[PDB]
Structures are given as structure tokens and as C-alpha cells.
């Protein structure tokens, strides 16, 4: 009667979803698809109810009629009187990250370097950096800017996938799910950390959560923040402590989307689910933590404190903000009002 079908992207998210499903007594169940776009289609068909999406994906989903329902909310400094669920989200900082040792690499020298992206169509990983590059370059040939990239979701035979590594068996190169070694925030940062790419397009939080012992993962356990620099738009380089003065954009927080007709029910169930499995949840960590994935950001980002209610009932365009929507629209002209499916 009140069962929510979550859409998991790839087999690792599927595994976490199944654990959530078990622990929830089948109040949540799981559909799985290979890509985020496929999950959006499942939701559109009514074969799944909801999933949590990066802003670039919210754009795709929103064009197709899906609506934002609750947003990720991480640790915050203002909005102090307020409980996390009622606290207004503050967006995250999209950054360009390089190795300090890669001296003289700036925003202005990026042409014909190697790049690491979270995925095509994602905010910090793609829409922001490529939007800026297309703009300043005056060219839609964003596929010819970097010499090689890992941009999960691009054509696997193209240079945009050249740096992608696939899964442990070396299969699924460039798939836009966590099976691709260099997928997502953590994967794109790993792509930089291992010096596969010269630059990673990620968010401020990724740099911090994967350095100075914050991650015990083999590739990350030895990383020091001091070995990294942020690329500012004015051509300068800054320590990763300076993200507030050296970022590419403020991104709208990842958020849960659903069909408008299921939004009320999805919200209700999620608010109850996080009461059980969220940050201070009754049953986390003893049984299941909804916002933990061993840094793999499965289903939700690992730094999520809670899912927050959205003031005003925003449309997807209101949630993303007019400037970001128009930035995406402008970028999409390279590849105006219609669902892609
Ligand atoms: C960039 O991201 C990092 C990681 O999320 C932020 O550092 C955290 O900030 C909170 C307070 O907001 C601290 O209580 C945590 O201890 C910090 N985490 C770590 C691992 O150090 C940092 O504030 C962000 N910088 C900006 C400018 O937003
Ligand atoms: C890239 O350039 C386009 C075109 O100038 C930008 O789109 C403009 O954005 C401003 C500020 O939000 C709007 O007031 C204009 O109406 C937009 N112009 C057009 C022609 O659509 C876009 O924001 C830029 N992209 C990025 C990522 O900065
Ligand atoms: C943290 O993620 C969010 C959440 C809601 C947002 C709402 C807006 C509204 C600004 C407009 C034009 O609606 C902008 C950016 C937003 C970013
Ligand atoms: C499932 O949902 C109902 C409320 O609709 C509740 O009675 C039941 O205990 C819930 N259990 C879990 C584990 O979420
Ligand atoms: Fe994102
Ligand atoms: Zn700013
Ligand atoms: Zn409104």
C-alpha cells in the first residue's frame, strides 16, 4: 500500500538497495538499471518511483516531467536554529583540481591536457566546466579540447573515454555507473590521484574526503591535500582550503526526484526511512546506514546528513536555478523544451 520502488544505478547500488529493502521490511524495494538515464526512464514508465540525482540529471528528469522531492543536505555553518530536514540547502562548490607538482597548469593552459570527469551531463563534472570551456573557446567542439579524458557516458571508442578503465575485469569501460573505476566524484578524483588525468572536475568535498586519512581506500590512503591545487577562473592556483574563493560554480544539491503523482508518497516514506537509517537514525549504524557507502557515494552521497524538505514546492527549474538551467540549455545547443525520451 505504501511501498516505494527505488532505482539503483548499476550492481553496487543494487546491492546497497537490496540491503535497504531487507532492513526496511520491503517498505522500499529495488529496480536496477545500468545508467541514470535508464533509471529516469523506469521512473517515467512507473516501474520505479524515485532516485537521487545530480543537478544535470535533474534537468533531464525535469524536462520529462519528474519533480524534485527532497534534497541532500550535508554539514553546514549558518541556518543554526534549524533541524537538518528544515535547513535550506547551500549548494556545493564545483572545482577544478590538479596536482601541485603539475606546475604551471592553470585554467588558461587546460587545452590538450588530460581530464577526469564524474560523468557526461553531471554538474561539477561536465555541465559547469564544459559550459565554461565552450563559452571561452567560442566552439562546440568540446570533444576536441582535452587530448584524452575519462567522461563516463561518452562514446567508449572516443577520446572522451580514452582514460576510463572499466571494472576489475577491464569490462564496461566508460559506463556511467560505479563499475567504471573512474566514475563519479571519487572516481574522477582517483583518475587525478593516479595521474591518469591532469585535471579532475569534482566538488570541494571530494578533495577533503579522500585525503589526509579521510579515506582508507588503497588509492587514497596516502594522499595529502597539500599535493593538490584548485584552478581558479582568473588563472591562479590555490590550496584546496580556498574553495570558497576558487571554484567554477555553486551547484544545486543532489536531490530525490519522482513522478509528480508519486512525490507526496515518496517524501513521506523517505522522511520515515531516514529517521531509521539516516545520520542519527534509530538503526544506523547497528543495522543499516542509508548515507554510508565506504566513500563510493552509492544511492546518496556519503556526506549527506539528511534529506531536506524543499521550501516553496519548487519546479525543477526553480530548484536548479534560472542561471544553471540556461547554462545547460546553452551547452546542449552543441549536441529547447522536450523530454529526451
Ligand atoms: C570543503 O569540503 C570539506 C569537506 O566537506 C569541508 O570541511 C568540512 O567542514 C565542516 C564544517 O563545515 C567540518 O566540521 C568538517 O570537519 C570538515 N571535514 C573535513 C574532512 O575536514 C569544507 O568546509 C569545505 N570548504 C568550503 C569552502 O565549503
Ligand atoms: C555561457 O554563455 C551563455 C551565453 O552568454 C550564458 O548564457 C547566458 O547567461 C546569462 C546569465 O545567467 C543570462 O542572463 C543570458 O540570458 C544567457 N544568454 C544566452 C544567450 O542564453 C551561459 O550562462 C554561459 N555558461 C556558463 C556555464 O557560464
Ligand atoms: C542547494 O541546491 C539548491 C537548491 C535550491 C536552489 C534554488 C535556487 C533558486 C534560484 C532560482 C532561479 O530559483 C537556486 C539554487 C538552488 C540550489
Ligand atoms: C514500514 O512501514 C510501516 C508504516 O507505513 C510501518 O508500520 C513499518 O514498521 C515500517 N517498517 C520499516 C522497517 O520501515
Ligand atoms: Fe553533482
Ligand atoms: Zn562563487
Ligand atoms: Zn515556485
Residue 337, domain member (yes or no): no
Closest by alpha carbon to 49, among 319, 257, 255, 253?
257
- The answer to whether 128 and 55 are in contact (CB under 8 A) is no
Residue 339, domain member (yes or no): no
What whole-number distance in Å separates Cα of residue 325 and Cα of residue 55?
A: 9
- The answer to whether 53 and 316 are in contact (CB under 8 A) is no
124 is in an annotated binding site: yes
Q: How many CB atoms lie within 10 A of CB 233?
A: 15
92 is in an annotated binding site: yes
User: Measured in whole angstroms, how far is the alpha carbon of residue 249 from the centre of its chain?
Assistant: 14
Ligand in nearest proximity to the CA of 91? 3
Residue 85, domain member (yes or no): yes
Residue 306, domain member (yes or no): yes
Question: What 3-state class would DSSP assign to 108?
Answer: helix
Distance 318 CA to ligand 6 centre (A): 19
Q: Which three cell numbers mark 320?
A: 536548479
- The answer to whether 74 and 304 are in contact (CB under 8 A) is yes
What whole-number distance in Å separates Cα of residue 174 and Cα of residue 126?
A: 14
Q: Whose CA is nearest to atom 3 of ligand 4?
A: 27
* Alpha helices (H) along the chain: 11-23, 36-45, 55-63, 128-137, 184-193, 204-209, 263-277, 316-320, 322-332
Do 47 and 146 share a domain, yes or no? no
Half-sphere exposure for 100 (CA within 13 Å, toward CB): 10
Residue 335, domain member (yes or no): no
Ligand 3 neighbourhood includes 321 CB (under 6 angstroms): yes
Way the structure was solved = X-ray
Half-sphere exposure for 315 (CA within 13 Å, toward CB): 8
What is the bridge-based pairing of β-strands 148-150 and 114-117?
Answer: parallel
Distance 248 CA to ligand 6 centre (A): 7
Question: Is the N-terminal amide bond of 310 cis, ω within 30° of 0?
Answer: no
Q: Which three cell numbers mark 66?
A: 519528474
What whole-number distance in Å separates Cα of residue 171 and Cα of residue 242?
A: 38
Ligand 2 neighbourhood includes 132 CB (under 6 angstroms): yes
Question: What 3-state class would DSSP assign to 53?
Answer: strand
Do 143 and 170 share a domain, yes or no? yes
CATH number at residue 303: 3.40.190.10
Do 60 and 123 share a domain, yes or no? no
What is the bridge-based pairing of β-strands 50-53 and 66-73?
Answer: unpaired
Residue 341, domain member (yes or no): no
Residue 340, domain member (yes or no): no
Its domain, for residue 23, covers 2-73+255-316
Do 26 and 83 share a domain, yes or no? no
Do 78 and 215 share a domain, yes or no? yes
Do 37 and 135 share a domain, yes or no? no
Question: What 3-state class would DSSP assign to 47?
Answer: coil
Question: What 3-state class would DSSP assign to 13?
Answer: helix
Do 47 and 133 share a domain, yes or no? no
Angle at 25 between CA 21 and CA 31, to 5 degrees: 30
Do 42 and 179 share a domain, yes or no? no
Closest by alpha carbon to 326, among 64, 131, 100, 58?
131
Q: Which three cell numbers mark 266?
A: 515518496
Ligand 1 neighbourhood includes 221 CB (under 6 angstroms): no
Do 67 and 79 share a domain, yes or no? no
Q: Which three cell numbers mark 340?
A: 529526451
What whole-number distance in Å separates Cα of residue 97 and Cα of residue 286?
A: 36
Phi then psi for 125, rounded to 5 degrees?
Answer: -75, -30
Distances (CA, A) of 323 to 121, 251, 261, 326: 16, 11, 28, 5
Query: What is the residue-wise DSSP string for 61-87?
Result: HHHTTEEEEEEEE---SS-TTS-GGGS
Distance 327 CA to ligand 2 centre (A): 6
Q: How many CB atoms lie within 10 A of CB 50?
A: 26
229 is in an annotated binding site: no
186 is in an annotated binding site: no
Do 137 and 192 share a domain, yes or no? yes
- Name the one residue in this structure whose C-alpha cell is 569501460: 173
Do 144 and 108 share a domain, yes or no? yes
Question: What 3-state class would DSSP assign to 264?
Answer: helix
- The answer to whether 5 and 33 are in contact (CB under 8 A) is no
What whole-number distance in Å separates Cα of residue 54 and Cα of residue 246?
A: 21
Q: How many CB atoms lie within 10 A of CB 194?
A: 14
Q: How many domains does the chain have?
A: 2
What whole-number distance in Å separates Cα of residue 117 and Cα of residue 85?
A: 30
Residue 338, domain member (yes or no): no
Distance 128 CA to ligand 2 centre (A): 12
Do 63 and 42 share a domain, yes or no? yes
Amino acid at each position: 500500500y505504501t511501498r516505494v520502488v527505488w532505482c539503483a544505478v548499476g550492481p553496487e547500488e543494487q546491492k546497497k538497495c537490496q540491503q535497504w529493502s531487507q532492513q526496511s521490511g520491503q517498505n522500499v524495494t529495488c529496480a536496477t538499471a545500468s545508467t541514470t538515464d535508464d533509471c529516469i526512464v523506469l521512473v517515467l514508465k512507473g516501474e520505479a518511483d524515485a532516485l537521487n540525482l545530480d543537478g544535470g540529471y535533474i534537468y533531464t528528469a525535469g524536462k520529462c516531467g519528474l519533480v524534485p522531492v527532497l534534497a541532500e543536505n550535508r554539514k553546514s555553518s549558518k541556518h543554526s536554529s534549524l533541524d537538518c530536514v528544515l535547513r535550506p540547502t547551500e549548494g556545493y562548490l564545483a572545482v577544478a583540481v590538479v596536482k601541485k607538482a603539475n606546475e604551471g597548469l592553470t585554467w588558461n593552459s587546460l587545452k590538450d591536457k588530460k581530464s577526469c570527469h564524474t560523468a557526461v551531463d553531471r554538474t561539477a563534472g561536465w555541465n559547469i566546466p564544459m559550459g565554461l570551456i565552450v563559452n571561452q573557446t567560442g566552439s562546440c567542439a568540446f570533444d576536441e579540447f582535452f587530448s584524452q579524458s575519462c567522461a563516463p557516458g561518452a562514446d567508449p571508442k572516443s577520446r572522451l573515454c580514452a582514460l576510463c578503465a572499466g571494472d576489475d575485469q577491464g569490462l564496461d569501460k566508460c559506463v556511467p555507473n560505479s563499475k567504471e573505476k573512474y566514475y563519479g566524484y571519487t572516481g574522477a578524483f582517483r583518475c587525478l590521484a593516479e595521474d591518469v588525468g591532469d585535471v579532475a572536475f569534482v566538488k570541494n568535498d571530494t578533495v577533503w574526503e579522500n585525503t589526509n586519512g579521510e579515506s582508507t581506500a588503497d588509492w587514497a590512503k596516502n594522499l595529502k591535500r597539500e599535493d593538490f591545487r584548485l584552478l581558479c577562473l582568473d588563472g591562479t592556483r590555490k590550496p584546496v582550503t580556498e574553495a570558497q574563493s576558487c571554484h567554477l560554480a555553486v551547484a544545486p544539491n543532489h536531490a530525490v526526484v519522482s513522478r509528480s503523482d508519486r512525490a507526496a508518497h515518496v517524501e513521506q516514506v523517505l522522511l520515515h526511512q531516514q529517521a531509521l537509517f539516516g545520520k542519527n537514525g534509530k538503526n544506523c549504524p547497528d543495522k543499516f546506514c542509508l548515507f554510508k557507502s565506504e566513500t563510493k557515494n552509492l544511492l546518496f552521497n556519503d556526506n549527506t546528513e539528511c534529506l531536506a524538505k524543499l521550501g516553496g514546492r519548487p519546479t525543477y527549474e526553480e530548484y536548479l536555478g534560472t542561471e544553471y538551467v540556461t547554462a545547460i540549455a546553452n551547452l546542449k545547443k552543441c549536441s529547447l523544451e522536450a523530454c529526451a525520451f
